[PDB]
């Protein structure tokens, strides 16, 4: 793995191809990263804005936490209010919510891999040097969806016209221009991935369209209430057929294009199986069974905690063990449990190393944990999940890797693909189950009042990991409302013991081939799929 002998700092600000505004500072010694700080650089304050309002409106405000992970926050707020009301949720609301969420996973992960992460591995200019006939044969050898020499030649020509124009647009100043020792793939592999990048730009439109069939629109869905869902049209055969036709198409693209490209890329970057590992993992599980909304263990995959990579010893998840530190964050006070959370800003200066981020540092029972697809897939593995354990075993077999390779930037990236695949296939069953349930069950919503005094918490394991919303209601209004969001966990700063958060820790040991072109920092940070609108809110 190439590496310089650079000793000194490196700052990446803006760290692009993420959502939101992130600054990364690292210290390097001998071309190896020894220390890292994650700096979230925008605050908005949605928790404070929510105080005093009608709990029914919370979901509409919190959905504006983030539009990449659109819907997720509406779902978590609705789940939160429904926990506080603690009355039965219609089975069809669960079904339709689960289906829309599965479609969100398919969309989000597809766009992350191609349009936010791939340029860290794919040299677009190297694609211009490819033999289009060789690229077709490479493409055809890894997928049942076939291509011709002419189609790949056509892609190269359009690309050539673009680059020759000198207006490189979003590829301007790319780290791979002029060559970079950190980029390993051959031109034919580069052209295959580049062609698919472009196809996926159109494909994602159709994937997203699927959420609009029941959920009104994408982005920012508008079909949920505390008590169920509002889309009576989702009961009609015409909407169900449309949803199914789009799902099938979305599934095919994932199975035939994304997943083999991810495997192609992993096959060139096996050394990254030894870079950016972490030890502890936390997942909240997802996709409750009908009747099971209040029980995390009813979920298609279950929550769990894993310490020191002991996957065979998954521990229970106890929400009361969640606390958020602020010692190194721009807020006042000390660590708090979210029902007692506080968000009083305390800014120092940009570039400070004492207090350096608008992200709180959440800790589980005092430990630093990673959340997200890798976390949830390891927890599932340890729970012997019916499709996730064999799927993981098969990936490792394909790439000829040991399980130790899971605990890395490569494994993190692979796990995002695996989660996409298993959810995409399970959707078929949920859809059939929903369609069979509505034969007799025509209910989609119950009319419930907001209680005068109560508390609830909503949980979701979404694209980037464990999301939770925590509300106390007094006098029928929002007393306190706190969000604890996946990227809060992964991209938080150090805690009150000085212990870094997952991403900060993962960056330790990263080799840097060119301090002026830190593709390696980006590879690892992008593998966590950070959203800073989410993490800070």
């Amino acid at each position: 793995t190439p590496r310089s002998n650079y000793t000194g700092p490196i700052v990446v600000d803006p760290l692009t191809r993420i959502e939101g505004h992130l600054r990364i500072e690292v210290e390097v010694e001998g071309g190896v990263i020894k220390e890292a700080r994650s700096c979230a650089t925008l605050f908005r304050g949605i928790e404070t804005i929510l105080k005093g309002r009608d709990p029914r409106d919370a979901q509409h405000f919190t959905q504006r936490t983030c539009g990449v992970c659109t819907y997720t926050h509406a779902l978590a707020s609705t789940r939160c209010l429904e926990d506080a009301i603690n009355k039965p949720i219609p089975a069809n609301a669960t079904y339709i919510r689960n289906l829309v969420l599965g479609n969100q996973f398919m969309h989000d992960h597809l766009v992350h891999f191609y349009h936010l992460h791939a340029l860290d591995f794919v040299d677009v200019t190297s694609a211009l040097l490819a033999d289009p006939a060789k690229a077709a044969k490479l493409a055809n050898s890894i997928s049942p969806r076939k291509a011709t020499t002419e189609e790949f030649a056509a892609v190269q020509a359009k690309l050539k016209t673009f680059v020759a124009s000198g207006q490189l647009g979003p590829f301007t100043n790319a780290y791979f221009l002029g060559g970079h020792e950190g980029y390993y793939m051959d031109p034919e592999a580069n052209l295959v991935c580049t062609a698919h990048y472009l196809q996926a730009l159109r494909a994602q439109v159709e994937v997203a369209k699927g959420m609009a069939v029941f959920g009104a629109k994408n982005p920012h869905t508008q079909f949920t209430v505390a008590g169920g869902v509002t889309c009576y049209e989702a009961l009609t055969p015409e909407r169900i057929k449309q949803f199914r036709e789009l799902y099938v198409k979305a599934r095919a693209f994932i199975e035939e294009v994304y997943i083999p490209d991810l495997l192609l890329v992993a096959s060139y970057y096996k050394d990254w199986g030894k870079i950016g590992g972490t030890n502890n993992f936390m997942a909240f599980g997802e996709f409750p069974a009908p009747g099971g909304e209040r029980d995390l263990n009813s979920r298609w995959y279950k929550p769990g905690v894993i310490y020191d990579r002991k996957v065979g010893s998954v521990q229970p998840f106890d929400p009361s063990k969640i606390e958020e530190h602020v010692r190194h964050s721009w807020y006042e006070g000390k660590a708090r449990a979210p029902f007692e959370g506080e968000t009083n800003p305390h800014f120092t200066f940009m570039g400070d190393t004492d207090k350096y981020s608008w992200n709180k540092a959440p800790r589980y029972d005092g430990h630093a944990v990673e959340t997200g697809p890798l976390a949830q897939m390891l927890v599932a593995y340890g729970h012997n999940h019916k499709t996730i354990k064999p799927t993981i075993d098969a990936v490792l077999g394909k790439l000829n890797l040991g399980p130790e390779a899971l605990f890395s930037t490569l494994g993190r990236t692979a796990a995002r693909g695996i989660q996409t695949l298993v959810i995409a296939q399970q959707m078929e069953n949920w859809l059939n189950e929903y369609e069979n349930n509505i034969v007799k069950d025509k209910q989609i919503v119950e009319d419930y009042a907001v209680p005068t005094s109560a508390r609830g918490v909503g949980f979701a394991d979404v694209s980037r990991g464990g999301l939770s919303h925590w509300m106390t209601i007094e006098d029928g209004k929002i007393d306190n409302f706190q969000l604890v969001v996946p990227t809060t966990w992964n991209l938080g700063p150090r805690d009150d013991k000085g212990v870094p958060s997952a991403a900060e820790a993962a960056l330790v040991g990263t080799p840097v081939a060119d301090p002026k072109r830190p593709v390696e920092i980006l590879r690892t940070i992008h593998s966590f799929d950070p959203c800073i609108a989410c993490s800070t809110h």
Partner: protein, 262 residues
């Protein structure tokens, strides 16, 4: 040769960038390879850090000039320090760049009017672009919604590239997309007029598709083209049985709440 477009993100949720990605007249790949040159966009651009900053400066001090699309509000509280990029406050960055643009388009309710972070009690003293840079002679075209329809965003841009006439309403919005209320365009208007209302979501009236006014719909106060052009070529909130929350209206967070009442 292709016209230069700079896209900036201030205080936003990236909903507008995602909407843009849903464009289908034309598709986004067509737009950035053929129709425009997208020279800066933090969500998809290759470069980071100093290389990104250099790309941005090249674009802004470029020959043919550039069009600026800005997403999000400007946080001005605490000497503009609630929002930084590359060690500069967001205020300072837009104060520098927005006057250099041949034109500015405010995309999303936040860049237009302040949006979610400006809602009471507005912890960061967030301001929409025209509020914030009035004094600089900046006069953006407002394309609101939360997020806006890609048909309105791209449509506004395309009309400008065509040297077309873009009439604005009293709060800066293209009348070609925002000239009528949602309610006037609504397929359930016959029920409204007939006095046929759903009293609750679990009711027969809602099941038969009656008007949502009594469960909060703000359609009559809200200007946008949602029932006519649809989202994702296929649906909109009221057709999905949920009231309009008036998301293309100034201060809707505070003026249209509570959402489930009129």
């Amino acid at each position: 040769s292709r016209p230069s477009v700079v896209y900036l993100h201030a205080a936003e949720c990236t909903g507008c960038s995602e909407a843009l990605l849903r464009t289908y007249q034309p598709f986004i790949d067509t737009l950035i390879l053929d129709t425009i040159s997208l020279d800066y966009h933090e969500t998809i651009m290759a470069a980071a850090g100093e290389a990104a900053e250099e790309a941005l400066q090249a674009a802004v001090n470029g020959p043919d000039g550039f069009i600026c699309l800005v997403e999000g509000a400007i946080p001005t509280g605490m000497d503009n320090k609630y929002g930084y990029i590359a060690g500069h406050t967001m205020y300072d960055i837009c104060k520098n760049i927005l006057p250099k643009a041949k034109a500015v388009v405010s995309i999303g309710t936040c860049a237009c009017y302040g949006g979610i972070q400006a809602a009471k009690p507005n912890p960061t003293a967030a301001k929409g672009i025209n509020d914030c840079y009035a004094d600089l002679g900046v006069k953006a075209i407002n394309v609101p919604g939360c997020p806006p329809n890609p048909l309105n965003m791209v449509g506004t841009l395309v009309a400008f590239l065509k040297g077309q006439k873009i009439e604005l309403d009293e709060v800066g919005r293209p009348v070609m997309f925002f000239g009528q209320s949602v309610h006037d365009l609504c397929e359930r208007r016959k029920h409204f007029d007939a006095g046929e209302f759903a009293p609750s979501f679990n009711s027969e009236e809602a099941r038969k598709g009656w008007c949502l006014y009594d469960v909060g719909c703000k359609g009559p106060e809200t200007y946008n083209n949602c029932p006519k052009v649809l989202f994702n070529e296929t649906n909109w909130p009221v057709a999905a049985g949920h009231p309009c929350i008036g998301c293309s209206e100034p201060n809707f967070w505070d003026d249209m709440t509570p959402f489930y009442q009129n």
